Amino acid sequence: SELVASILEAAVQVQRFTTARVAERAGVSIGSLYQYFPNKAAILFRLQSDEWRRTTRLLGEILEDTTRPPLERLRRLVLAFVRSECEEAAIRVALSDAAPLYEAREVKAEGARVFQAFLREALPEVAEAERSLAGDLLTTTLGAVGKQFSEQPRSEAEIERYAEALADMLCAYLAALGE
Amino acid sequence: SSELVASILEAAVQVLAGAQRFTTARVAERAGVSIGSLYQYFPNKAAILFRLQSDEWRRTTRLLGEILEDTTRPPLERLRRLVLAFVRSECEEAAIRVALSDAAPLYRDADEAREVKAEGARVFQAFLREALPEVAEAERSLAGDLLTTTLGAVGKQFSEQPRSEAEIERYAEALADMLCAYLAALGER
């Protein structure tokens, strides 16, 4: 647990991702790492899974906060989502080497549902059929455009700018719906 | 020659619209031709799909330019029409691409599409110069990227399911509403 946590931290910290390397950083024997993760894929599947859980929590927290108006909340969500895709991409790439023949839609699906409730709050005048369609388009666009953006490595500044443009598009659509 | 080729190609599109049911025998029939006669022009089902694919790519490249260059119509109207045409073509070309993965699983399904996208970003960049003359080049260029990415990635995901003309129309109108709202907001500063 403390040992696993440190392993996982050394892993989340450590393309040339290896077991020997994560154990060397963790200050443990590879024997000892091997008790918890028999291989590099095993570590990556845990990183992947902890990430989806962290992001589901975070994205839900952004949309429920009420020190900010809905358009502000949506902008913050977009930034957090794009940053998160760029991280999911690095693990996907490593997983591609480690488990070549190797869910994300069950996570996508729950994200969507939470977003529709936010819409309900942000668009009280908008008929349910329109609000549904809009929530589908918003969540599909965020997911599809975020994922494509992350198919190559990005700088922090690239991420911030792209997220700002993407939010401008999504927020403009949200505002036009509410006017 | 060219008349018989066109009826087979039209027949093949009819047959497809499914993809697990795509065979030459089934297209020869629709077309009212012998399977022997189809064979001269297309020696297997993959060759028919490859032809439908490249025809659809040229058409779409033709339509992108023609729609967005049409200065009869104001810019956002052109964009709405482009969105509807692009979505339509994605929902027709979902079936070609699925049939191909069954027919020719090794086939390089990403490379030639990127060249198609490239001619797309170029045309979008020119359109925004006209739609948004007062927007700095760096913003417009980012907006043009985002528009191109969005249309393609969203149209594509939407096409993963079979859609009615009404669905397509309803979804394309919302997608265009989003894009049009974004450009309008950019022009207001």
mmCIF file of C-alpha atoms in Angstrom:
data_model
loop_
_atom_site.group_PDB
_atom_site.id
_atom_site.type_symbol
_atom_site.label_atom_id
_atom_site.label_comp_id
_atom_site.label_asym_id
_atom_site.label_seq_id
_atom_site.Cartn_x
_atom_site.Cartn_y
_atom_site.Cartn_z
ATOM 1 C CA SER A 1 0.000 0.000 0.000
ATOM 2 C CA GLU A 2 2.646 2.549 1.044
ATOM 3 C CA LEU A 3 4.976 0.411 -1.130
ATOM 4 C CA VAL A 4 2.457 0.325 -3.974
ATOM 5 C CA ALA A 5 1.762 4.044 -3.626
ATOM 6 C CA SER A 6 5.519 4.818 -3.889
ATOM 7 C CA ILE A 7 5.859 2.429 -6.853
ATOM 8 C CA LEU A 8 2.907 4.151 -8.535
ATOM 9 C CA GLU A 9 4.314 7.611 -7.771
ATOM 10 C CA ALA A 10 7.769 6.575 -9.171
ATOM 11 C CA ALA A 11 5.864 5.221 -12.206
ATOM 12 C CA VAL A 12 3.623 8.336 -12.724
ATOM 13 C CA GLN A 13 6.936 10.285 -12.392
ATOM 14 C CA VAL A 14 9.248 8.006 -14.496
ATOM 15 C CA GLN A 15 8.576 5.182 -24.458
ATOM 16 C CA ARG A 16 11.539 4.056 -22.380
ATOM 17 C CA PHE A 17 9.250 3.390 -19.386
ATOM 18 C CA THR A 18 10.497 0.185 -17.750
ATOM 19 C CA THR A 19 10.087 -1.884 -14.619
ATOM 20 C CA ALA A 20 13.829 -1.756 -13.776
ATOM 21 C CA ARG A 21 13.555 2.040 -14.104
ATOM 22 C CA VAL A 22 10.474 2.425 -11.862
ATOM 23 C CA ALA A 23 12.023 0.164 -9.156
ATOM 24 C CA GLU A 24 15.308 2.048 -9.320
ATOM 25 C CA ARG A 25 13.480 5.340 -8.707
ATOM 26 C CA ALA A 26 11.249 3.765 -6.035
ATOM 27 C CA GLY A 27 14.373 2.695 -4.181
ATOM 28 C CA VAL A 28 13.236 -0.932 -4.206
ATOM 29 C CA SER A 29 14.447 -4.271 -5.538
ATOM 30 C CA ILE A 30 12.877 -5.423 -8.786
ATOM 31 C CA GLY A 31 11.995 -8.547 -6.861
ATOM 32 C CA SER A 32 9.927 -6.345 -4.617
ATOM 33 C CA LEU A 33 8.217 -4.455 -7.437
ATOM 34 C CA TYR A 34 7.495 -7.840 -9.040
ATOM 35 C CA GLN A 35 5.404 -8.879 -5.998
ATOM 36 C CA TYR A 36 2.972 -6.083 -6.832
ATOM 37 C CA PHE A 37 3.261 -5.771 -10.604
ATOM 38 C CA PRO A 38 4.596 -8.740 -12.568
ATOM 39 C CA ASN A 39 5.359 -6.451 -15.532
ATOM 40 C CA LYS A 40 5.332 -2.970 -17.096
ATOM 41 C CA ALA A 41 1.743 -3.355 -18.533
ATOM 42 C CA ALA A 42 0.440 -4.169 -15.068
ATOM 43 C CA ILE A 43 1.820 -0.782 -13.789
ATOM 44 C CA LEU A 44 0.368 1.054 -16.830
ATOM 45 C CA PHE A 45 -3.085 -0.470 -16.470
ATOM 46 C CA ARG A 46 -3.085 0.752 -12.896
ATOM 47 C CA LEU A 47 -1.905 4.205 -13.940
ATOM 48 C CA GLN A 48 -4.620 4.217 -16.655
ATOM 49 C CA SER A 49 -7.297 3.215 -14.260
ATOM 50 C CA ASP A 50 -6.339 5.656 -11.467
ATOM 51 C CA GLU A 51 -6.341 8.459 -14.061
ATOM 52 C CA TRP A 52 -9.880 7.781 -15.300
ATOM 53 C CA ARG A 53 -11.071 7.788 -11.649
ATOM 54 C CA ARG A 54 -9.225 11.071 -10.892
ATOM 55 C CA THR A 55 -10.597 12.765 -14.001
ATOM 56 C CA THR A 56 -14.238 11.608 -13.426
ATOM 57 C CA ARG A 57 -13.987 13.082 -9.893
ATOM 58 C CA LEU A 58 -12.422 16.307 -11.144
ATOM 59 C CA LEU A 59 -14.730 16.890 -14.082
ATOM 60 C CA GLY A 60 -17.789 16.314 -11.780
ATOM 61 C CA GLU A 61 -16.391 18.799 -9.211
ATOM 62 C CA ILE A 62 -15.858 21.559 -11.835
ATOM 63 C CA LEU A 63 -19.463 21.350 -13.115
ATOM 64 C CA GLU A 64 -20.988 21.376 -9.604
ATOM 65 C CA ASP A 65 -19.007 24.339 -8.179
ATOM 66 C CA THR A 66 -21.096 27.554 -7.798
ATOM 67 C CA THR A 67 -18.661 30.324 -7.019
ATOM 68 C CA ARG A 68 -18.617 30.537 -10.886
ATOM 69 C CA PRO A 69 -21.303 30.973 -13.602
ATOM 70 C CA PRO A 70 -21.904 27.977 -15.934
ATOM 71 C CA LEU A 71 -19.829 29.385 -18.829
ATOM 72 C CA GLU A 72 -16.874 29.765 -16.493
ATOM 73 C CA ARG A 73 -17.356 26.206 -15.258
ATOM 74 C CA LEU A 74 -17.496 24.869 -18.825
ATOM 75 C CA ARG A 75 -14.215 26.709 -19.720
ATOM 76 C CA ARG A 76 -12.400 25.169 -16.681
ATOM 77 C CA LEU A 77 -13.821 21.698 -17.566
ATOM 78 C CA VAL A 78 -12.454 22.018 -21.138
ATOM 79 C CA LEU A 79 -8.949 22.889 -19.883
ATOM 80 C CA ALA A 80 -8.948 20.004 -17.380
ATOM 81 C CA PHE A 81 -10.283 17.604 -20.029
ATOM 82 C CA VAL A 82 -7.694 18.477 -22.667
ATOM 83 C CA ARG A 83 -4.863 18.242 -20.063
ATOM 84 C CA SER A 84 -6.197 14.858 -19.066
ATOM 85 C CA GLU A 85 -6.349 13.522 -22.700
ATOM 86 C CA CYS A 86 -2.737 14.506 -23.183
ATOM 87 C CA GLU A 87 -1.926 12.301 -20.102
ATOM 88 C CA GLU A 88 -4.183 9.375 -21.186
ATOM 89 C CA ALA A 89 -2.240 9.532 -24.546
ATOM 90 C CA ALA A 90 1.188 8.960 -22.954
ATOM 91 C CA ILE A 91 -0.129 5.923 -21.072
ATOM 92 C CA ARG A 92 -1.923 4.640 -24.254
ATOM 93 C CA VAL A 93 1.385 4.873 -26.131
ATOM 94 C CA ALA A 94 3.251 2.983 -23.416
ATOM 95 C CA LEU A 95 0.380 0.425 -23.246
ATOM 96 C CA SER A 96 0.683 0.002 -27.022
ATOM 97 C CA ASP A 97 4.301 -1.190 -26.620
ATOM 98 C CA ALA A 98 3.643 -3.286 -23.487
ATOM 99 C CA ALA A 99 0.240 -4.900 -24.321
ATOM 100 C CA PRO A 100 0.155 -4.613 -28.160
ATOM 101 C CA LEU A 101 -3.163 -6.470 -28.531
ATOM 102 C CA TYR A 102 -4.872 -4.352 -25.869
ATOM 103 C CA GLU A 103 -14.146 0.589 -21.293
ATOM 104 C CA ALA A 104 -13.047 4.168 -22.063
ATOM 105 C CA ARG A 105 -16.612 4.560 -23.400
ATOM 106 C CA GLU A 106 -18.148 3.497 -20.037
ATOM 107 C CA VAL A 107 -16.165 6.425 -18.575
ATOM 108 C CA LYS A 108 -17.138 8.671 -21.559
ATOM 109 C CA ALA A 109 -20.784 7.697 -21.001
ATOM 110 C CA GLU A 110 -20.847 8.673 -17.335
ATOM 111 C CA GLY A 111 -19.114 11.992 -18.156
ATOM 112 C CA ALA A 112 -21.930 12.712 -20.615
ATOM 113 C CA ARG A 113 -24.752 12.020 -18.069
ATOM 114 C CA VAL A 114 -23.162 14.416 -15.516
ATOM 115 C CA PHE A 115 -22.875 17.035 -18.266
ATOM 116 C CA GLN A 116 -26.616 16.744 -19.098
ATOM 117 C CA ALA A 117 -27.510 17.645 -15.483
ATOM 118 C CA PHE A 118 -25.244 20.675 -15.739
ATOM 119 C CA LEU A 119 -27.156 21.671 -18.900
ATOM 120 C CA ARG A 120 -30.416 21.338 -17.065
ATOM 121 C CA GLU A 121 -29.036 23.934 -14.655
ATOM 122 C CA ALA A 122 -27.474 26.199 -17.262
ATOM 123 C CA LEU A 123 -30.358 26.111 -19.821
ATOM 124 C CA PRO A 124 -33.668 26.228 -17.858
ATOM 125 C CA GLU A 125 -35.683 27.734 -20.784
ATOM 126 C CA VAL A 126 -34.418 25.271 -23.428
ATOM 127 C CA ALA A 127 -36.783 22.446 -24.322
ATOM 128 C CA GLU A 128 -35.516 18.997 -23.259
ATOM 129 C CA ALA A 129 -35.057 17.617 -26.820
ATOM 130 C CA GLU A 130 -32.841 20.571 -27.772
ATOM 131 C CA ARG A 131 -30.945 20.463 -24.475
ATOM 132 C CA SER A 132 -30.294 16.709 -25.052
ATOM 133 C CA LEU A 133 -29.028 17.297 -28.585
ATOM 134 C CA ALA A 134 -26.824 20.148 -27.338
ATOM 135 C CA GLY A 135 -25.393 18.037 -24.517
ATOM 136 C CA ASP A 136 -24.604 15.287 -26.980
ATOM 137 C CA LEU A 137 -22.863 17.634 -29.357
ATOM 138 C CA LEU A 138 -20.918 19.374 -26.561
ATOM 139 C CA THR A 139 -19.659 16.151 -24.943
ATOM 140 C CA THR A 140 -18.863 14.494 -28.323
ATOM 141 C CA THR A 141 -16.967 17.611 -29.485
ATOM 142 C CA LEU A 142 -14.992 17.906 -26.206
ATOM 143 C CA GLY A 143 -14.131 14.176 -26.291
ATOM 144 C CA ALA A 144 -13.421 13.865 -30.053
ATOM 145 C CA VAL A 145 -11.454 17.118 -30.460
ATOM 146 C CA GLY A 146 -9.555 16.645 -27.104
ATOM 147 C CA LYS A 147 -8.556 13.120 -28.075
ATOM 148 C CA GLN A 148 -7.396 14.118 -31.569
ATOM 149 C CA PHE A 149 -5.400 17.051 -30.124
ATOM 150 C CA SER A 150 -3.576 14.508 -27.851
ATOM 151 C CA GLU A 151 -2.451 12.194 -30.713
ATOM 152 C CA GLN A 152 0.816 14.076 -30.612
ATOM 153 C CA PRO A 153 2.876 15.425 -27.675
ATOM 154 C CA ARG A 154 1.932 19.005 -26.656
ATOM 155 C CA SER A 155 3.652 21.818 -24.650
ATOM 156 C CA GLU A 156 1.880 23.376 -21.640
ATOM 157 C CA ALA A 157 1.409 26.512 -23.657
ATOM 158 C CA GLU A 158 0.001 24.557 -26.652
ATOM 159 C CA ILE A 159 -2.478 22.901 -24.323
ATOM 160 C CA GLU A 160 -3.585 26.166 -22.740
ATOM 161 C CA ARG A 161 -4.095 27.948 -26.031
ATOM 162 C CA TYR A 162 -5.942 25.061 -27.655
ATOM 163 C CA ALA A 163 -8.200 24.556 -24.601
ATOM 164 C CA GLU A 164 -8.959 28.363 -24.652
ATOM 165 C CA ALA A 165 -10.043 28.197 -28.368
ATOM 166 C CA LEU A 166 -12.050 25.034 -27.810
ATOM 167 C CA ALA A 167 -13.792 26.554 -24.814
ATOM 168 C CA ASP A 168 -14.508 29.706 -26.804
ATOM 169 C CA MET A 169 -16.316 27.512 -29.350
ATOM 170 C CA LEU A 170 -18.200 25.470 -26.799
ATOM 171 C CA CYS A 171 -19.065 28.511 -24.579
ATOM 172 C CA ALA A 172 -20.278 30.502 -27.650
ATOM 173 C CA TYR A 173 -22.630 27.633 -28.431
ATOM 174 C CA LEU A 174 -23.785 27.440 -24.788
ATOM 175 C CA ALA A 175 -24.415 31.234 -24.740
ATOM 176 C CA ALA A 176 -26.321 31.220 -28.076
ATOM 177 C CA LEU A 177 -28.555 28.432 -26.697
ATOM 178 C CA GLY A 178 -29.289 30.541 -23.565
ATOM 179 C CA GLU A 179 -30.068 33.642 -25.687
ATOM 180 C CA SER B 1 -16.740 0.999 -70.676
ATOM 181 C CA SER B 2 -17.908 4.178 -68.765
ATOM 182 C CA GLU B 3 -21.730 3.666 -68.722
ATOM 183 C CA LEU B 4 -21.543 0.115 -67.334
ATOM 184 C CA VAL B 5 -18.934 1.191 -64.724
ATOM 185 C CA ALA B 6 -21.301 3.942 -63.557
ATOM 186 C CA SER B 7 -24.315 1.578 -63.145
ATOM 187 C CA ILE B 8 -22.183 -0.911 -61.131
ATOM 188 C CA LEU B 9 -20.895 1.908 -58.920
ATOM 189 C CA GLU B 10 -24.446 3.248 -58.430
ATOM 190 C CA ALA B 11 -25.625 -0.320 -57.744
ATOM 191 C CA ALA B 12 -22.835 -0.821 -55.186
ATOM 192 C CA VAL B 13 -23.790 2.343 -53.276
ATOM 193 C CA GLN B 14 -27.435 1.161 -53.242
ATOM 194 C CA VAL B 15 -26.422 -2.292 -51.915
ATOM 195 C CA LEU B 16 -24.249 -0.817 -49.195
ATOM 196 C CA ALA B 17 -27.013 1.473 -47.914
ATOM 197 C CA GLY B 18 -25.390 -3.332 -45.098
ATOM 198 C CA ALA B 19 -21.541 -3.638 -44.955
ATOM 199 C CA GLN B 20 -21.398 -7.274 -43.773
ATOM 200 C CA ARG B 21 -23.749 -7.996 -46.675
ATOM 201 C CA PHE B 22 -21.481 -6.410 -49.334
ATOM 202 C CA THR B 23 -20.651 -8.895 -52.093
ATOM 203 C CA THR B 24 -20.106 -8.730 -55.842
ATOM 204 C CA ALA B 25 -22.965 -11.156 -56.580
ATOM 205 C CA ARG B 26 -25.311 -8.796 -54.762
ATOM 206 C CA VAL B 27 -24.047 -5.727 -56.731
ATOM 207 C CA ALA B 28 -24.111 -7.468 -60.152
ATOM 208 C CA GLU B 29 -27.790 -8.257 -59.494
ATOM 209 C CA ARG B 30 -28.870 -4.706 -58.555
ATOM 210 C CA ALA B 31 -27.041 -3.477 -61.651
ATOM 211 C CA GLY B 32 -28.849 -5.952 -63.926
ATOM 212 C CA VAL B 33 -25.569 -7.373 -65.151
ATOM 213 C CA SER B 34 -23.799 -10.724 -65.149
ATOM 214 C CA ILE B 35 -21.307 -11.344 -62.385
ATOM 215 C CA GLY B 36 -18.980 -12.224 -65.323
ATOM 216 C CA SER B 37 -19.535 -8.776 -66.689
ATOM 217 C CA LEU B 38 -18.918 -7.060 -63.384
ATOM 218 C CA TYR B 39 -15.663 -9.079 -63.139
ATOM 219 C CA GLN B 40 -14.148 -7.363 -66.169
ATOM 220 C CA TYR B 41 -14.369 -3.988 -64.454
ATOM 221 C CA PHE B 42 -13.961 -5.043 -60.823
ATOM 222 C CA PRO B 43 -12.218 -8.389 -60.196
ATOM 223 C CA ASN B 44 -13.348 -8.510 -56.470
ATOM 224 C CA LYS B 45 -15.438 -6.751 -53.836
ATOM 225 C CA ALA B 46 -12.387 -4.745 -52.519
ATOM 226 C CA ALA B 47 -11.809 -3.208 -55.948
ATOM 227 C CA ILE B 48 -15.384 -1.913 -55.950
ATOM 228 C CA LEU B 49 -14.949 -0.453 -52.393
ATOM 229 C CA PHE B 50 -11.603 1.130 -53.281
ATOM 230 C CA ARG B 51 -13.248 2.828 -56.274
ATOM 231 C CA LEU B 52 -16.247 4.038 -54.214
ATOM 232 C CA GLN B 53 -13.750 5.386 -51.666
ATOM 233 C CA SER B 54 -11.629 7.381 -54.027
ATOM 234 C CA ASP B 55 -14.707 8.732 -55.793
ATOM 235 C CA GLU B 56 -16.081 9.897 -52.470
ATOM 236 C CA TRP B 57 -12.772 11.623 -51.546
ATOM 237 C CA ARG B 58 -12.601 13.563 -54.859
ATOM 238 C CA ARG B 59 -16.285 14.572 -54.613
ATOM 239 C CA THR B 60 -15.865 15.903 -51.126
ATOM 240 C CA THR B 61 -12.675 17.818 -51.898
ATOM 241 C CA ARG B 62 -14.611 19.258 -54.884
ATOM 242 C CA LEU B 63 -17.590 20.205 -52.599
ATOM 243 C CA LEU B 64 -15.489 21.746 -49.821
ATOM 244 C CA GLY B 65 -14.013 24.296 -52.175
ATOM 245 C CA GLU B 66 -17.177 24.858 -54.222
ATOM 246 C CA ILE B 67 -19.361 25.427 -51.136
ATOM 247 C CA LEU B 68 -16.909 27.676 -49.252
ATOM 248 C CA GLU B 69 -15.829 29.636 -52.316
ATOM 249 C CA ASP B 70 -19.476 30.324 -53.326
ATOM 250 C CA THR B 71 -19.550 34.133 -52.798
ATOM 251 C CA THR B 72 -23.192 34.296 -53.961
ATOM 252 C CA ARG B 73 -24.029 33.391 -50.312
ATOM 253 C CA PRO B 74 -22.947 35.021 -47.094
ATOM 254 C CA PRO B 75 -20.097 33.174 -45.228
ATOM 255 C CA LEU B 76 -22.089 31.500 -42.465
ATOM 256 C CA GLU B 77 -24.719 30.210 -44.872
ATOM 257 C CA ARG B 78 -21.866 28.549 -46.845
ATOM 258 C CA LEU B 79 -20.611 26.991 -43.612
ATOM 259 C CA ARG B 80 -24.014 25.562 -42.675
ATOM 260 C CA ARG B 81 -24.270 23.968 -46.187
ATOM 261 C CA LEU B 82 -20.751 22.652 -45.908
ATOM 262 C CA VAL B 83 -21.566 21.064 -42.518
ATOM 263 C CA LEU B 84 -24.628 19.353 -43.861
ATOM 264 C CA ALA B 85 -22.777 18.121 -46.995
ATOM 265 C CA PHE B 86 -19.778 16.921 -44.896
ATOM 266 C CA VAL B 87 -21.971 15.058 -42.370
ATOM 267 C CA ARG B 88 -23.976 13.455 -45.224
ATOM 268 C CA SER B 89 -20.811 12.288 -46.866
ATOM 269 C CA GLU B 90 -19.428 10.843 -43.532
ATOM 270 C CA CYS B 91 -22.691 8.835 -43.050
ATOM 271 C CA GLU B 92 -22.426 7.470 -46.611
ATOM 272 C CA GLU B 93 -18.661 6.697 -46.198
ATOM 273 C CA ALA B 94 -18.931 4.907 -42.830
ATOM 274 C CA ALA B 95 -20.267 1.861 -44.701
ATOM 275 C CA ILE B 96 -17.552 1.969 -47.400
ATOM 276 C CA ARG B 97 -14.830 2.112 -44.699
ATOM 277 C CA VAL B 98 -16.353 -0.737 -42.630
ATOM 278 C CA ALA B 99 -16.782 -2.952 -45.717
ATOM 279 C CA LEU B 100 -13.161 -2.254 -46.596
ATOM 280 C CA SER B 101 -11.898 -3.339 -43.168
ATOM 281 C CA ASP B 102 -13.601 -6.666 -43.727
ATOM 282 C CA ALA B 103 -12.456 -6.936 -47.370
ATOM 283 C CA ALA B 104 -8.923 -5.603 -47.097
ATOM 284 C CA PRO B 105 -7.835 -5.576 -43.416
ATOM 285 C CA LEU B 106 -4.189 -4.635 -44.159
ATOM 286 C CA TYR B 107 -5.153 -1.557 -46.184
ATOM 287 C CA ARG B 108 -3.573 1.742 -45.054
ATOM 288 C CA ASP B 109 -6.699 3.599 -43.857
ATOM 289 C CA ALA B 110 -5.113 6.773 -42.310
ATOM 290 C CA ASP B 111 -2.436 8.026 -44.809
ATOM 291 C CA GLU B 112 -4.539 9.127 -47.841
ATOM 292 C CA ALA B 113 -7.158 10.676 -45.532
ATOM 293 C CA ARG B 114 -4.585 13.109 -44.030
ATOM 294 C CA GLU B 115 -3.891 14.536 -47.509
ATOM 295 C CA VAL B 116 -7.693 15.011 -47.877
ATOM 296 C CA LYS B 117 -7.802 16.823 -44.504
ATOM 297 C CA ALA B 118 -4.829 18.985 -45.609
ATOM 298 C CA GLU B 119 -6.633 20.439 -48.655
ATOM 299 C CA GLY B 120 -9.410 21.031 -46.094
ATOM 300 C CA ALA B 121 -7.461 23.207 -43.641
ATOM 301 C CA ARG B 122 -6.147 25.254 -46.563
ATOM 302 C CA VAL B 123 -9.679 26.058 -47.855
ATOM 303 C CA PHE B 124 -10.910 26.869 -44.341
ATOM 304 C CA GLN B 125 -7.979 29.241 -43.849
ATOM 305 C CA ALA B 126 -8.983 31.205 -47.009
ATOM 306 C CA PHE B 127 -12.671 31.265 -45.991
ATOM 307 C CA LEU B 128 -11.869 32.817 -42.599
ATOM 308 C CA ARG B 129 -9.775 35.529 -44.274
ATOM 309 C CA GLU B 130 -13.051 36.568 -45.989
ATOM 310 C CA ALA B 131 -15.415 35.788 -43.111
ATOM 311 C CA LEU B 132 -13.191 37.409 -40.463
ATOM 312 C CA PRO B 133 -11.001 40.135 -42.084
ATOM 313 C CA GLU B 134 -10.519 41.987 -38.787
ATOM 314 C CA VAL B 135 -9.265 38.958 -36.812
ATOM 315 C CA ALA B 136 -5.483 38.612 -36.316
ATOM 316 C CA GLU B 137 -3.879 35.879 -38.487
ATOM 317 C CA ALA B 138 -2.760 33.771 -35.506
ATOM 318 C CA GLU B 139 -6.288 33.586 -34.032
ATOM 319 C CA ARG B 140 -7.939 32.905 -37.399
ATOM 320 C CA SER B 141 -5.411 30.214 -38.095
ATOM 321 C CA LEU B 142 -6.134 28.531 -34.750
ATOM 322 C CA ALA B 143 -9.888 28.906 -35.413
ATOM 323 C CA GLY B 144 -9.444 27.322 -38.848
ATOM 324 C CA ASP B 145 -7.593 24.362 -37.319
ATOM 325 C CA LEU B 146 -10.289 23.913 -34.678
ATOM 326 C CA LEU B 147 -13.118 24.152 -37.274
ATOM 327 C CA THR B 148 -11.438 21.534 -39.526
ATOM 328 C CA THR B 149 -10.664 19.183 -36.615
ATOM 329 C CA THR B 150 -14.151 19.584 -35.200
ATOM 330 C CA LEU B 151 -16.068 18.997 -38.385
ATOM 331 C CA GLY B 152 -13.988 15.929 -39.171
ATOM 332 C CA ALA B 153 -13.757 14.361 -35.725
ATOM 333 C CA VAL B 154 -17.410 15.035 -34.847
ATOM 334 C CA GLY B 155 -18.845 14.094 -38.316
ATOM 335 C CA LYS B 156 -16.848 10.923 -38.130
ATOM 336 C CA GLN B 157 -17.990 9.836 -34.612
ATOM 337 C CA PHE B 158 -21.613 10.635 -35.540
ATOM 338 C CA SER B 159 -21.308 8.332 -38.625
ATOM 339 C CA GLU B 160 -20.356 5.300 -36.519
ATOM 340 C CA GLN B 161 -24.107 4.605 -36.363
ATOM 341 C CA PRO B 162 -26.621 4.452 -39.244
ATOM 342 C CA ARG B 163 -28.605 7.717 -39.448
ATOM 343 C CA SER B 164 -31.865 8.802 -41.138
ATOM 344 C CA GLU B 165 -31.980 11.914 -43.380
ATOM 345 C CA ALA B 166 -33.880 13.671 -40.556
ATOM 346 C CA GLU B 167 -31.260 12.705 -37.905
ATOM 347 C CA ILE B 168 -28.451 13.825 -40.182
ATOM 348 C CA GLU B 169 -30.235 17.106 -40.864
ATOM 349 C CA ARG B 170 -31.011 17.708 -37.177
ATOM 350 C CA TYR B 171 -27.405 16.864 -36.085
ATOM 351 C CA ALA B 172 -25.802 18.846 -38.910
ATOM 352 C CA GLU B 173 -27.934 21.884 -38.007
ATOM 353 C CA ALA B 174 -26.754 21.722 -34.327
ATOM 354 C CA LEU B 175 -23.088 21.185 -35.359
ATOM 355 C CA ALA B 176 -23.379 24.155 -37.691
ATOM 356 C CA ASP B 177 -25.069 26.215 -34.940
ATOM 357 C CA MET B 178 -21.999 25.555 -32.744
ATOM 358 C CA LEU B 179 -19.522 26.498 -35.488
ATOM 359 C CA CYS B 180 -21.526 29.517 -36.546
ATOM 360 C CA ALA B 181 -21.846 30.712 -32.901
ATOM 361 C CA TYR B 182 -18.041 30.411 -32.479
ATOM 362 C CA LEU B 183 -17.217 32.452 -35.631
ATOM 363 C CA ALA B 184 -19.810 35.102 -34.824
ATOM 364 C CA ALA B 185 -18.270 35.465 -31.342
ATOM 365 C CA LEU B 186 -14.831 35.846 -32.910
ATOM 366 C CA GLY B 187 -16.065 38.642 -35.246
ATOM 367 C CA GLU B 188 -17.641 40.570 -32.355
ATOM 368 C CA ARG B 189 -14.278 41.593 -30.817
#
